[PDB]
Amino acid sequence: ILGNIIESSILSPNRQLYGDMHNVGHVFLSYTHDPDHRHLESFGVMGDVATAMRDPVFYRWHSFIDDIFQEHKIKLPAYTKSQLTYEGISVTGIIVQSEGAPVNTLHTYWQQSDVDLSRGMDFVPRGNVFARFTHLQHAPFQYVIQIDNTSDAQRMGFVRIFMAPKNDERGQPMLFRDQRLFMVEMDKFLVALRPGANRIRRRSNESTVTIPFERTFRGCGWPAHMLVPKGLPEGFPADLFVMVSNYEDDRVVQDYCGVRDRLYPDRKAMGFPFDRLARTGVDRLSNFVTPNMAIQSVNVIHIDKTVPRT
Amino acid sequence: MNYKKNLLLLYDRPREPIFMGKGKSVFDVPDNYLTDRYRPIGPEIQNRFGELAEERIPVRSIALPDLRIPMSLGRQEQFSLFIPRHRKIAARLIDIFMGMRNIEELQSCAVFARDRINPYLFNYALSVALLHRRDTKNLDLPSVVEVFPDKYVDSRVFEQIREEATVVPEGMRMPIVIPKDFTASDLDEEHRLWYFREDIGVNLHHWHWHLVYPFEASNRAIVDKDRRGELFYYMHSQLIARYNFERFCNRLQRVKRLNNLREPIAEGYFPKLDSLVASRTWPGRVDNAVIKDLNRELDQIKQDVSDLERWIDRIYEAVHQGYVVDESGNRIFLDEEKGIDILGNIIESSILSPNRQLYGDMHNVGHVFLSYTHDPDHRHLESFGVMGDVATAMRDPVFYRWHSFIDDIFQEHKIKLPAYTKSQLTYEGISVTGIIVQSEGAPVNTLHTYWQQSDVDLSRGMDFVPRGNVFARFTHLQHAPFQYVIQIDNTSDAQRMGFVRIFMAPKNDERGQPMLFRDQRLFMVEMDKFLVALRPGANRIRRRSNESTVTIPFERTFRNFCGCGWPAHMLVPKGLPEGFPADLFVMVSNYEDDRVVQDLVGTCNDYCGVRDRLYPDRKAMGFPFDRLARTGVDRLSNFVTPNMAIQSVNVIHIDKTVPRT
Amino acid sequence: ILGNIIESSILSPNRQLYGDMHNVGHVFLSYTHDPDHRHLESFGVMGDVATAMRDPVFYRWHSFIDDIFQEHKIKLPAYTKSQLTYEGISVTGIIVQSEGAPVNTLHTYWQQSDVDLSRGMDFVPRGNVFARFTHLQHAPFQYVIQIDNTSDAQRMGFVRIFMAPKNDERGQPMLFRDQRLFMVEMDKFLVALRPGANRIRRRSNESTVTIPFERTFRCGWPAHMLVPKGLPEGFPADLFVMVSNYEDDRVVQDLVGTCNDYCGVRDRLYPDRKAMGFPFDRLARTGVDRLSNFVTPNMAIQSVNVIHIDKTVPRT
Ligand SMILES: [Cu+2]
Ligand SMILES: [Cu+2]
Ligand SMILES: [Cu+2]
Ligand SMILES: [Cu+2]
């Protein structure tokens, strides 16, 4: 509801009262240079969805808006130990492995790619016109998750993978209240677990948050090369987190893939483990955890070089 | 593969154990698949029926979910989808069969379950699974008459069929005549409508419609079909239109609705059916029975009449208000487009209802109340009467009263919609100048009807009866074949696409006057709706009666929309011996507006087309006449636009029995 | 809320709309014999709280009213396995023992008691006027509950004891949906559990549902009516106990607890955060079907037999 109210979608239960808050903000910010049209100038970059993210103020305005949503989320009751426990299931470890790199280590760098802008160049002599984009890229990797069943029956589960910074700006191990808002979703997929223990593997390129290279260059798809934060040359410390929830509860009976048409495939709230405040006694991630969750220290290394695509 | 054909053997002889062997086959069942009663002497039995068997189907022993819930219903009990508890049992079993990934495990699960659960329930649960799995598509399910003849035939025949099959050798067996007009004498004027109420055809159509459009299970398990709410409204609405027609052909007035539930029900009905599965008969309802508060602890029914009345009061309010309220508290508006569809889901109570808890389960609960007047607190350990089962509900006259009431509620919404403007139902350029009908050896604009015996093999359904054939002779209404001939002028300069919409109503009333629109619009029965391409200038369109999109062939039944299909022999009202006057109406609408862009090869009751996503007509169901007249209009002959035509038809009945040839 | 709406207490959020439903019903039922006052007659017994329970119609009218409340309770979400489990605590058995009677057996009978009605007899020669009441009575008994801690720390818990019929009127083992509504509260008290094993014993006369003889004659439910009558041939009944986590159920409060007719509860708050009738007020969670599979470790069931004996014991 709140979302439709704030952005102002015709789905808002009372547009007239609660207004067109997000959208009107984009216009105000884009017209500071000429607000009464006396200079016959058009809107700046924040006035177009196509270009809005280029401006730093975008993140300030969208940061504010988020705080308003948060104000609602902190009213919701904390998830109980019960609610995010999976009776029988226990995750005992998660790691990541890249080719030619230590365990629990992600790498990033720059990479040139080519795009044919020929169809867009009006009144230009026909032919090919290739442009070379430089953009962040990460070395391919894969998660390896150790899950024990101890039930006697095949258990269905949702694997939910987020990643946040390990410490704060002052260099201390982050508290939950802070860290919960910095967790970025990395993957969410359905898995069948055989009784006893199974060792689950997932490639970085199978991510349900991401869409392939081919789609961009040639919800609805975050660029694959932007999946991993940049990190530092000296290495940036990060907590990798995984949760296995009970898919039977989370299931949405129905016939990146294709979320347009019918329903969204997860009954749980979006950002589910961390959308709400901590239950009493919880203070940091390492004591928020239930058996069916696992934490892992990852180190994100950047290298200022321009690699190829082979 | 074979598997598809092997499941069809489960439908054979429902009460004979699965190890007894069906047709030219027999199942090689594990011993842990044998029932507790028979397992302790399984060796002696498997041996005893092993003889004379051609082929032998193996069955692998699988896990099998807990079948507690499916087995909760007794084996000698009746099964109805109206009863709250049965719904939960069936929906759970459907879930099991539906949840078997492979067509081999479905065969194994089925073979085990079959002899542990209620036959009627099994048949339903299987039927639903097969019809809506992907591997078991285009599969021709045996007619439910052939598997359960007890729901379709006077109980008297059963002891004749047993005699004939035991005494007389195969090949020399006489066909068993099925009694007609047997539920009441001429002291009851209602007995005249036997040929409609008690006709095998229409009862099968009703049962099947509810198969393909259930109101409970899972949206992917077939509940959320396009405009199923509107379908529920229209189909049932056409039943009463057709019934009211047949009433006029038997010197009766239009069916009176169930005004209010406290007043007695004048018309009793003893159905004369004997359930061989329950081993009992269906109870009758006496004259002037009164609805009573139900307390059927076993069935999980605790409903008061006032509950029903409360639901009705609320639904009326919503309809007048013009909007409903969902569980969340939000308002949804009963607009021109989706209003009727919503209302349908509210009234029948399909899980698609935007607020079941508030607006209730009005139609369904009514069926239960009416079926339990004779034993509402279960003190007499009696089952529900005929109105409690979709398979048999149409036999009772009260069906039409209850369904008549329900229709009035829908009407209350339709009369709020804005009249179709001259513009909206004109086709610029197109003009229909005449329509006629012609039967072989009969004047123009004249339809004939009569009685006709047909034969059906009830052999598969006769449990513990000496094997062989058992043919039964049904007598049923039939019409002489005919064809429409429609004269349409283009005057445009381009090929025009159009929908031909053909309805038929009575010409006058019972008081002898040319009917007014307000009245007549509700008595129009759909006769055909088909797409036609018109060349510039003049076009002579011809259409056979047997091409009707309202109807399904003989062959399908024996072997009124968007379900199984309406029986072909019931397409034409009976009429009178002296001739019954009727207005035939045709309209050509602009198919470009009415078109529903979609890809389909079209599909059957299992007419084809409606199993694909969408319903193939953007216009409302009953489109020319669903809404009130625009200003100035008063009767059909001044409602008409150029692209419509009227024709006086005369319907003649002849009391004779023709053969099928 | 619903309670204040239905009875009609000035606490009703809209008296004018939802009316004075319970109370007005009492008046209607009491005035059938003279509703327009043409006969100058007063109201029958249902018109006075003091006497209303004497009439059988009371239970019909109050039965209806209850169905309305139920209609709300069945909308509430089922208690989850989690919500009524006490991690660590396990009840392994409960029994009852009366002096000179088999285990798991309650006895009832008639008993005369005496009351001085002297102060109430106006214009009667002064002196004593003792009246002999005959009323149901039960032999004294005590519960014995076996609870295991398996935690390593002292655990606080609420003991919640209800009793229902075992079967129905037709003689079949009752389903939960039915039986949950027939459970009568028998006791609810706080207990401290030591690590390992604990044997809890509780007397019938310590019941928090009941008030002593002396209080009533010489506000709470009469002690002699604590146990149903049962049959001469014995009436089968399921005794149920639950130990809930008192830390969740606790109501931080300062309390006097001295016969303010039952401890009292005249202090601001009611001493239990859980709903009244808490184990059984709501519908069953999925899969549950009867009491014996509703149970969690921290609960226990026991077959009791209630025997009546048609004899008159003295009051002692
Ligand atoms: Cu924005
Ligand atoms: Cu129906
Ligand atoms: Cu119906
Ligand atoms: Cu009262």
Side-chain angles (χ1 to χ4, degrees), chain A residues 117-187:
Chain A
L117 305 181
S118 217
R119 60 166 83 254
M121 291 305 174
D122 307 281
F123 314 116
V124 166
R126 271 293 203 180
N128 283 11
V129 176
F130 291 110
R132 266 214 220 301
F133 189 47
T134 299
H135 58 87
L136 181 76
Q137 190 34 275
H138 63 91
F141 65 100
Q142 44 149 245
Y143 314 94
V144 184
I145 318 164
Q146 311 181 121
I147 312 167
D148 295 352
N149 199 325
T150 91
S151 74
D152 288 304
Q154 156 165 306
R155 285 282 160 284
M156 248 42 192
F158 253 131
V159 187
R160 299 169 186 284
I161 308 176
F162 296 83
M163 200 200 313
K166 197 209 174 65
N167 324 321
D168 56 355
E169 326 108 290
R170 328 266 210 117
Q172 315 302 313
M174 209 162 201
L175 298 176
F176 190 77
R177 35 164 203 120
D178 293 339
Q179 197 194 19
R180 84 179 175 78
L181 304 179
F182 290 106
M183 281 283 174
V184 325
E185 194 181 343
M186 298 296 295
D187 218 324

Side-chain angles (χ1 to χ4, degrees), chain B residues 148-207:
Chain B
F148 289 128
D150 49 65
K151 289 183 164 169
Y152 294 96
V153 149
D154 180 345
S155 70
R156 264 192 174 165
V157 311
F158 281 115
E159 283 304 313
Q160 300 171 11
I161 288 162
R162 232 179 282 286
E163 185 167 40
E164 191 74 7
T166 298
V167 172
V168 180
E170 282 160 281
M172 274 180 283
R173 249 106 90 159
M174 293 268 63
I176 310 303
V177 329
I178 304 304
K180 84 281 149 48
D181 190 25
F182 69 104
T183 56
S185 79
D186 317 64
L187 302 175
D188 193 2
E189 70 199 7
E190 292 297 339
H191 92 308
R192 295 175 210 164
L193 280 278
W194 66 268
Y195 68 83
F196 184 105
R197 289 189 290 91
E198 287 158 23
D199 172 65
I200 297 297
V202 341
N203 270 114
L204 281 170
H205 161 251
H206 194 231
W207 163 262

Side-chain angles (χ1 to χ4, degrees), chain B residues 418-535:
Chain B
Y420 291 132
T421 70
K422 207 166 206 291
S423 163
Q424 279 174 313
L425 26 68
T426 269
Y427 197 171
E428 215 81 67
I430 302 295
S431 158
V432 184
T433 61
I435 177 162
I436 59 157
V437 298
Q438 302 176 130
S439 310
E440 186 149 359
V444 65
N445 295 347
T446 286
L447 303 167
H448 287 263
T449 63
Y450 47 81
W451 311 123
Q452 161 180 317
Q453 286 171 121
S454 294
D455 293 303
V456 180
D457 194 20
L458 304 182
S459 218
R460 2 151 100 282
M462 293 323 301
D463 306 283
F464 314 116
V465 166
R467 271 290 194 182
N469 276 256
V470 159
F471 288 108
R473 265 215 221 303
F474 290 109
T475 301
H476 58 87
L477 181 76
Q478 179 59 266
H479 63 91
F482 66 100
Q483 45 146 244
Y484 314 94
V485 185
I486 317 165
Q487 312 180 122
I488 312 169
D489 296 350
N490 199 326
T491 91
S492 74
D493 288 304
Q495 159 165 310
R496 285 282 160 285
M497 248 41 192
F499 252 135
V500 186
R501 301 168 184 284
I502 307 175
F503 296 83
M504 200 197 320
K507 197 209 172 65
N508 325 320
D509 54 359
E510 206 116 296
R511 311 179 287 131
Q513 276 287 319
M515 210 162 241
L516 299 173
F517 190 77
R518 16 157 288 202
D519 286 344
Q520 197 192 17
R521 85 178 176 78
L522 304 178
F523 289 107
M524 280 285 174
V525 325
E526 194 180 343
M527 298 297 294
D528 218 324
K529 185 219 299 177
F530 60 94
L531 179 53
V532 78
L534 310 174
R535 77 174 75 131

